Symmetry: C2
Subunit: 98 residues, 2 copies
């Protein structure tokens, strides 16, 4: 086993952008510990001529995530699931009843 090459601990975002800006492949990244938000992590990623940052969010149960899809209405949930599976284990897409 080897340590992960992407964990840089507490480093300034500017320092993260400086290093990642030098990487050649889009997607080159690192995880750093936020200086502004105690106990939080942020993901810094090279993409094109920029280095984007994504806060790592946590939920009540303590799980991590960058972004999830939630709906403001049943109508929107339904329409979204006509092209994204309603199931995590199988590919099932909604189609109107006849």
């Amino acid at each position: 086993m080897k340590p992960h090459p992407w964990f840089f601990g507490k480093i300034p975002r500017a320092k993260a952008e400086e290093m990642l800006s030098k990487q050649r492949h889009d997607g080159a990244f690192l995880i750093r510990e936020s200086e502004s938000a105690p106990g939080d992590f942020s993901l810094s990623v090279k993409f094109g001529n920029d280095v984007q940052h994504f806060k790592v969010l946590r939920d009540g149960a303590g799980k991590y995530f960058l972004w999830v899809v939630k709906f403001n209405s049943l109508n929107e949930l339904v329409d979204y699931h006509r092209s994204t599976s309603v199931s995590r284990n199988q590919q099932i897409f909604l189609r109107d009843i006849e």
Copy 2:
């Protein structure tokens, strides 16, 4: 504007399975109001020779969803995002730094 053909209100799940089992296309579905969980909705969908049911969950903010992806560790979040975009607005996939 026309009413949605998929909202059946409070009907027994068995009744939902009976009707959807007769549909010809996988994905034929309906939304019904759960008799067991007051105020909740469930999605019933035909798929193959079965009719599956998915509870419509709600979060603190009141938004709806069937399922979302959360991680038990940063390690898992990172690895998942090597093949699913870290961004909701662009396709950015993680690749190890050099």
